[PDB]
């Protein structure tokens, strides 16, 4: 029951653009899309559970969703061992049925319902040029996101625990009790540098910092939502922005693309919120595992130091060879052996633990190297082995999506500004702004 | 309105200037000037750089006994990696040069400059009344430059992997990249080369048709095209034709840039080795296998273990 090209001026390939003014159709579209997202979540969870064996680590069979639930700490024992698989199945089926409900609601709103909600439902109605109602909706959804963040904090602090990978003797599920709520450390990450050795927010190491940050962000979101419900934009705010649907979409696109890039970097580098036991080692982690395992083998067989060790430009003792570029790597199986001045010889000479050795072996064998043809190893690998680390998949996919959504921001922001100015359709062919200017010589 | 701020703003935003400045120009201009000055000075004269960080300097400056096709600004030394290395973090100016800071300076300023250039393109488009999205078309080369100079080093964890700012350096980078990853046998690079070839083809064909039609007509050119091959109803109006011309190369370059960034995280191209096997298990070589032999040669040759 769509409109014609003549009636709206938008061809079929620009069809959804006809929904800008209509509210009911747009609302149904949004609800149906949310249902689609949840449907994919549930279906992927069910399929991944169906093709999962608890014996092997999850990173060896291309698992991307179950590691998240494991990080939350469901059916996970010490060292990342799998205890029970029922939590994953229940999560997937719950997601899928909720998706069914959302899809029904979206179809009902999109197909048979008030195309415009303003006339009959003043509470839910809105107009793009309006400002107070936009702030009200923004506040509602800010409150919702704050409630979600506080739900995560409640789960971490009560009713179970999260899988901490920094626990002694390997990672395990732990219950947080004293999250770092100091503002100084919380915002130091936000002010930290983004270059090598600093990493901006990607350098978080302890789950304490994660929980503290989530507490702060949830409280801030709740307060901001309450503020925006009862407040109208300032005079300068109304003077520096374009208040139309496409402009809102443009700002959202820019924000979401930036967050996509940030998440790509976090997935590639960070290992606290992404335990190596589930997602697998990162590139620097694999290189350092290579160096550490080779040093251990050399020390065992032969039985700063010239064997695989050198001095960094700063001065600390670091692993030698091409691995020196990753001298800033930190991990649970390598932290105990590192003294204040980098790696101290006495630690590796005496302080060695078997689980560290086998973890290093299992990480060095499974380096984050692969091919689009699902063949692990370097591109010039003569034989065939099936392996591609999930971290590479996440990073590549989310980088591509972030870049495309940034391009979307550019396009939509340009179009919205042009439309607001009033010359988006084209030049008036009578009063060209260029003609009113002197010739350029 | 004689206040310093007022007149300075009017001068900045005025179209009376020979080259439009705009506010994006404020960051655009000085960044590119710094980049080009440092690049010229380094290319003309500069000491060797320790690209691999094992005390084996690589001459790359014009004055140090090398040619235009061989001169290049060596990338940052492998020892530093991703650490931020301005002048004021180096122990001394000589050490700064030996390690290879000017490449980092040039690349940072250049990336800022190109982004600001995109911004000013949009801003003047808005000023003159024309439609805004020319910056979208410009996003292809900018995306490729960002992928080559910034994203790939980030993926590999070191700034020494960025493209050297030279010609022979560019060839070395391309060859080493083929060795490490099969750039040739990757669908996104295939899309990129398809985009480039199609852009050349369409430019040539459109120029020929339009210049032949301009006699003293568009219907005649349309009939000519429709009779030369069997698609008579092809690009009836100029709007669709020119939009297609804009769209093809831009999408091609977007895809090749995305492919390069994808490989930055070690997701290589297709790996067709021992794909064909006869009975009772032998290996029959295919063209992919000769390509693999060449890749193995380059890979084992570039890696200086000693």
């Amino acid at each position: 029951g769509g409109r014609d090209q003549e009636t709206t001026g938008f061809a079929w390939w620009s069809g959804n653009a006809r929904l800008i003014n209509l509210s009911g159709k747009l609302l149904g579209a949004h609800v149906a899309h949310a249902g689609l997202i949840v449907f994919w979540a549930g279906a992927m969870n069910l399929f991944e559970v169906s093709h999962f064996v608890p014996e092997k680590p999850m990173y060896e069979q291309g698992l991307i969703l179950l590691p998240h639930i494991a990080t939350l700490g469901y059916g996970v024992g010490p060292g990342g061992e799998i205890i029970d698989t029922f939590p994953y199945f229940v999560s997937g089926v719950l997601h899928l049925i909720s998706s069914a409900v959302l899809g029904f609601g979206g179809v009902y709103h999109s197909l048979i319902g008030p195309e415009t909600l303003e006339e009959s439902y003043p509470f839910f109605g809105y107009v793009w040029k309006d400002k107070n109602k936009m702030t009200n909706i923004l506040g509602y959804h800010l409150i919702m996101l704050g409630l979600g963040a506080w739900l995560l904090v409640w789960k971490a602090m009560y009713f179970g625990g999260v899988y901490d990978t920094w626990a002694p003797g390997g990672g395990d599920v732990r219950v947080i009790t004293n999250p770092t709520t100091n503002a100084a450390v919380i915002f130091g990450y936000l002010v930290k540098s983004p270059f090598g050795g600093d990493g901006w927010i990607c350098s978080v190491d302890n789950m304490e910092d994660i929980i503290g940050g989530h507490i702060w962000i949830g409280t801030l979101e709740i307060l901001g939502g309450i503020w925006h419900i009862y407040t109208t934009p300032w005079p300068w705010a109304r003077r520096a922005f374009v208040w139309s649907g496409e402009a809102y979409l443009s700002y959202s696109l820019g924000a979401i693309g930036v967050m996509g890039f940030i998440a790509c970097c976090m997935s590639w580098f960070n290992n606290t919120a992404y335990p190596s036991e589930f997602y697998g080692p990162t590139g620097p982690e694999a290189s350092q595992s290579q160096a550490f395992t080779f040093l251990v083998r050399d020390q065992r067989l032969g039985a700063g130091l010239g064997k695989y060790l050198m001095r960094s430009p700063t001065g600390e003792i670091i692993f030698g060879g091409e691995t020196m570029r990753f001298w800033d790597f930190r991990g649970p199986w390598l932290e105990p052996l590192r003294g204040p001045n980098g790696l101290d010889l006495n630690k590796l000479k005496n302080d060695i633990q078997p689980w560290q050795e086998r973890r290093a072996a299992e990480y060095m064998t499974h380096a984050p190297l692969g091919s689009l043809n699902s063949v692990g190893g370097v591109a010039t690998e003569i034989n065939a082995v099936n392996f591609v680390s999930p971290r590479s998949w996440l990073a590549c996919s989310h980088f591509c999506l972030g870049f495309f959504f940034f391009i979307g921001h550019l396009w939509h922001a340009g179009r919205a500004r042009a439309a607001a100015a009033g010359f988006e359709k084209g030049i008036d062919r009578f009063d060209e702004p260029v003609l009113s200017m002197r010739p350029l010589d | 309105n004689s206040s310093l701020w007022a007149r300075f703003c009017e001068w900045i935003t005025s179209t009376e200037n020979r080259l439009y400045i705009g506010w994006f120009g404020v960051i655009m201009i000085p960044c590119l000037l710094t980049a080009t000055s440092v690049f010229i000075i380094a290319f003309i004269a500069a000491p060797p750089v320790d690209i691999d960080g094992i005390r084996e300097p690589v001459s790359g400056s014009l004055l140090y006994g090398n040619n235009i096709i061989t001169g290049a600004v060596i990338p940052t030394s492998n020892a530093i990696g991703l650490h931020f290395y301005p002048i004021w973090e180096a122990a001394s100016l000589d050490e700064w040069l030996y390690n290879g800071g000017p490449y980092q300076l040039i690349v940072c300023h250049f990336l800022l400059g190109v982004y600001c250039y995109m911004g000013r393109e949009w801003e003047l488009s808005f000023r003159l009344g024309m439609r805004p999205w020319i910056a979208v078309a410009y996003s292809a080369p900018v995306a490729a430059a960002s992928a080559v100079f910034l994203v790939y080093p980030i993926g590999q964890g070191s700034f020494s992997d960025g493209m050297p700012l030279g010609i022979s350096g560019t060839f070395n980078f391309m060859i080493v990249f083929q060795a490490e990853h099969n750039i040739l046998m990757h669908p996104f690079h295939m899309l990129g080369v398809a985009g480039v070839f199609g852009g050349s083809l369409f430019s040539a064909m459109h120029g020929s048709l339009v210049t032949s039609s301009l006699i003293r007509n568009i219907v005649a050119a349309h009939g000519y095209f429709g009779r030369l091959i069997f698609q008579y109803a092809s690009f009836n109006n100029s709007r669709s034709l020119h939009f297609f011309l804009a769209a093809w190369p831009v999408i091609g370059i977007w895809f090749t840039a995305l492919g390069l960034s994808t490989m930055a995280f070690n997701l290589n191209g297709f790996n067709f080795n021992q794909s064909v096997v006869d009975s009772q298990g032998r290996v029959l070589n295919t063209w992919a296998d000769i390509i693999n032999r060449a890749n193995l040669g380059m890979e084992v040759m570039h890696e200086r273990n000693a």
Binding site: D441 | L19, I44, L62, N67, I68
Partner: peptide
């Protein structure tokens, strides 16, 4: 002395670019 020749060529080319920018022939 080849270096001086190379710099001369590059600077000359840059001069051609500069003159093409700022000293354009007005149309017709």
């Amino acid at each position: 002395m080849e270096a001086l020749v190379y710099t001369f060529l590059l600077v000359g080319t840059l001069g051609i670019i500069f003159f093409s920018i700022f000293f354009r022939d007005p149309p017709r």
